[PDB]
Every structure is written in structure tokens, then in C-alpha cells.
Amino acid sequence: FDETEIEDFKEAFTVIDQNADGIIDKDDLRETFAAMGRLNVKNEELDAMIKEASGPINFTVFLTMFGEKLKGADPEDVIMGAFKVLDPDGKGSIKKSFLEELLTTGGGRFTPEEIKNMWAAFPPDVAGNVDYKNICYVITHGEDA
Amino acid sequence: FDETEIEDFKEAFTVIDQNADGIIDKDDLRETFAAMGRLNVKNEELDAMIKEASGPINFTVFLTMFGEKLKGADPEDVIMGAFKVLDPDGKGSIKKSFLEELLTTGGGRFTPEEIKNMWAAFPPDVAGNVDYKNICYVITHGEDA
Amino acid sequence: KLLGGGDVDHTQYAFGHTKVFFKAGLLGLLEEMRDDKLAEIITATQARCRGFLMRVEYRAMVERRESIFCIQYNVRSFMNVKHWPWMKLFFKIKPLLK
Amino acid sequence: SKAAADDFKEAFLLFDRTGDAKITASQVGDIARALGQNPTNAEINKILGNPSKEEMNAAAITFEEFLPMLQAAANNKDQGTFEDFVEGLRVFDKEGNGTVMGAELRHVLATLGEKMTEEEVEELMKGQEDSNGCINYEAFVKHIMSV
Amino acid sequence: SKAAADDFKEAFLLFDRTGDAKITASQVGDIARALGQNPTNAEINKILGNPSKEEMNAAAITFEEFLPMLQAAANNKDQGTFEDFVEGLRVFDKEGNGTVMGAELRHVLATLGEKMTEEEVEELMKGQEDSNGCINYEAFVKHIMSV
Known about the structure:
This is part of a larger assembly, with two copies of chain A, one copy of chain C and two copies of chain D.
Chain A: H1 3-16, H2 26-36, H3 43-50, H4 59-69, H5 76-86, H6 96-104, H7 112-119, H8 124-128, H9 134-140
Helix pairs in contact in A: 5-9
Chain C: E1 13-16, E2 19-22, H1 27-81, H2 85-93
Antiparallel strand pairs in C: 1-2
Chain D: H1 7-15, H2 28-33, H3 41-49, H4 63-73, H5 82-90, E1 99-101, H6 102-111, H7 118-125, E2 134-136, H8 137-144
Antiparallel strand pairs in D: 1-2
Helix pairs in contact in D: 6-7
């Protein structure tokens, strides 16, 4: 965890903790979702978020919960560092079959089935290994941009 | 030491001395590191910083310790002064082989092996002697920007 | 340029303006001996190369060691997270920030 | 002999991916090179077949066969003379300066004799050949014999 | 003599790159020039060989040989007469004004007698020759004798 990433989680903690007392309760979760447009947010969704913690969601409990789910989270500059080492001549997005062979043949984390799941929402270019960069974006901030 | 550089070290001394009494003790070092995100900062790192001084870290002991480690520290405007004299026509980053030849053939501080270490984290452009300016940045403030 | 390769007697032939000249069956014999002599010379020079070739692969494999992991773990996160309320939230919200 | 070098057995535990203390016959070529031996691939191939050992079918190994094969390859290290390596490349390009044109060394290392992949050829020229397209083989063969 | 000039020993510590207080025989020509002596390179060469000293093989030095070689070169400073330097270049170009055409002095300084590199020839004309292509050697030889 770099310090600017921890400051981003402190700003997200303050936007969900609308009572500003330092502990995100279930009313803060529901009023942050209603301010984003969720008028139908069920109480069972709020209870499942609180069921991931053993205590009240203060800043260090929110940081330890996000730490334990993001144990391989990598910032965009280090993902582009590794992709610039895979394309060491610069500019070009690397081939689809080169990333499939190098993921498998180096590591067990690069096994195929997982490579079909990589191509599956990370579209073609991304999946193929040709573009580059959009995948670093969606690994640090999810969903389609 | 120019006076604005000494005021920058006075501001860094006040941010690490969180008790504001004028002497940075080991608790100030640990609480400044914990406020930057270092939850695992060992006591042996704090003891190795205090082992570089012969007494308590007040403002003049911190200035003399930084003076004795930075006996060739050069501000960015004087490094760009010297690089504008090496590129006297302006704008262009100077060639890789020109900086290797002129470092060696003028001085013993510009010997090759050291030139391979210059290219080694100061990347290509920087190492090569083509870009310019990013090396002045990282000599006044380290690590990748 | 072609004759560059082969474990052949580089003697036995000779070039000129319109064509190459070649021995048989003596010069033919010569070359042959020669041929064997390069396998030696060659075969040995190949090896080191081969050897050496892979020796650089290890230096790369090794470097790579971590950059992968980084990549490895890093992805996994996301696959888990991207479905998490809190994380989607942070997401829509991450922009309003400065 | 021990000089009993027990670090050859510790390096066999770094190349065996299953942890059972056996190394397949296809890895023995590259691990002899990683222990400080450069047998040519035809030599590694011959010896194998010589001993009615087929590298075409599944293989396992034991340390008790890999140790004497490394000791049979260790006598052939007297073939590694650097005079003949630099004189080979000195006969490969004209003029009195040691420079191969880029693509001459890349196509010769991939297609002449024991085929080296073009991926390995690019990894062996990376850094020693600059953008002039001229590989200085005095420093190139020096750095190739540094590993 | 000391006048014991101990700054010659302090300048030997600025030219010895290893710090062991020895200066190789190939540096002795340029360091005699940096101590205020201009022996020609053939003279530096002869003296060396004269003393069965080979500048072809590795060399070291000691201060105890470099001091008397600088004192043997110091008698030859009576050959540095500026009348003959300005009259040499005055016979090298027509008319009553001291100007050499640029390329005449550059090709003569690189190819006639003791070969000066064209890099050093450009560094000695830089500033004294303007864009008219005419080197005024009255001020040019004045500035060359200012160092």
C-alpha cells in the first residue's frame, strides 16, 4: 500500500461515512447508495458488507478488509512497467499468443482456463495481448470505462 | 547550502518532529513513518538512523548529518546550467557517447564502470545523455517520478 | 554468401565473374576431410553458443521472476473485488475526488 | 570428487519442479550448462543415445545418473578456447576492427549448425549492438564468456 | 631545485588515476606540457628509447624518474621563440596582414610533421577564426602563448 492509495481509501471512507464520526454504519451505506441513485438498495446487501467485518467499520478495519481482498493489487504504473518489459521496443501492443504462452510457461497462475477468463471480459485486444493499458486501467479501477 | 534548501530541511524536520520540541527522537521517527503508511517499521531501522548521530537530532545536528552525506549535492538549476553548457545550442538532449567520452576524458569521476551505473537506473535517455532534465530532477529528489 | 554455411571445404571451390569453380574427385576428397574437420571445429563452436544461448535465458527468466507475481496476484485481486459493493462504490466515487 | 561440490545437488533441487529429486532427460543439457559446462547439443544427444537412452519418451532422473553424466561432460571443457572464438568472427568481417553487421550474426546463429531461436539470438545481442548495426565482438565475446 | 617547487608533486597526484603515486610513461609527455614545458613528441620519444625505456609495454612510474626527466626537458625551453612562430605563419600567406585561410592551417597542423588530430585542430581555432575563413595569427599565436 502506497500512501496515495491509502489517502484514496481515506477519501472514499469519508464519502461513505456521511455522519463523519469515523465509523461507517449501515445507515451510511444506505445513504451513500441512495445518493448515487440506488433507491432500491436492500438491507441484506448492507448486512452482507457488515458481515465481512468482525467489528465496526472504522478506518483501520476498512483498510484491513481491503488489504485482505487486494493481496495482489497492483497500481497502473507498475502494471505498465511490466508491460513495457514485455514490449521492450515500446509503443506496440504485444501478441495474443505470446501472452498466452508466456503466462502458462512461466507460472501456474498463467495456466490456460484462466487465460480464457482473461480474454472474456478483458476484451480481444486486451485478451489477445495487443493493446495494452486499458487492462491496467480496469485492474486498478474495475468495470468498463 | 542555499537558504531555501535549509528552509526545506527545516520543514522536513518539523514534519518528522511531531512533538514540536526541537529534537527528533525515535518515537517521532516511528510516528512519521506510520503516518506515511509504514505500519511494520522495525525499531532497528530507527536505531540505525539515530546511530548516524553522536547526539540528539536537533535542527543543527540534522543539518550537519545531511551536509556530510550531501557534500556534492547540486540544485536543479545548476545542473541544468551545466547541461545547457554541454548543449549550448539549446533544446536538444546530448548524445550517449558524448557524455561517456567527456566524463572519462576530463575527470576520474567520469571513469567508465561508474558510467554503467549511471545508465543503470538513470535510464536510457538519461544514461545515453539524450534527454535531460529528468536526471536533474532525480538528483535533487530521488526515486522514479 | 550461401557457401557461408556447411561443414564443407572452403578450399575446393573458387568463384569468378560468371560462375563458381568446384573440385570433384580429389578436391572432392579434400573437402570431405575438411567437412569432418568443421563438425569438430564447428560442433564444438556450436555447443558453447547453444550453451551460452540458454545461459541468457536463465538471466531473463530470473529477472522476470517477480514482475510476473506482481502481475499474477494483481489481477486476481480485481477478479474478486470488481464484484464487491464497496469497491464499486469507490469506483463511481473515485472520480469526484481530487 | 567433492573437492566434493554438494552445490550441484542443491542446484538439482532448484531445477526439479516436482520436488521428488529427479530431473528429466530433457533438462540435463541446460543444467550441465548451468553447472559450468558447455557440451554441444549433438554431444548431449549422442551420449544419451549412445547409452540406449531415448529422449523421445518420458524420462525421469536420479541424481546417481546425472552426477556421472556431468563428470563425463567435464573433460570436454578443454575445447572452450577464446582465441578461436574471436578469430572465427574476425574472419567473418572485413577491415581491422571487430564488427559484425547485425543481421549477419543473427541469421548465422539461428540457421547455421545447431539452431538457436531468434528469441535467444535477440537476447544475446541486446546491449552489445547499438543503433549503428555493428556488433563489436571483442566486447561481445568478452561478455558472453562472463557468464 | 626547490626553488623547490613541490607543486610538481601535487600535480602528479592529480594525473595519477590510481592514487599509488606512479604515472605511466604515456602520460609523461602531456604532464611535462602541463608543468610548463614544451618538448616535441619525437624528443619525448627519443629520450625514452635513449634510456632503453619501451613505451610499447606496460609502464609505471615513480616520482624519482619523472622529476629528473622534467629537469632534462627544462633546458630545452630556450627553443620557444615567438619571433619564429609569427614569421613562420607570415611566410605562409601573401600580403601585409596576418591571415591564414582556415583550411590551410587545419590541414597543415594535422598532416605536416607531428600529426595533430583534427579534433585538437578545431579546438585551437575555435574563437580566433571567424566566418570570413581568415585566421589572424597575430592574435592567434598570442592566445596560444597565453596558456
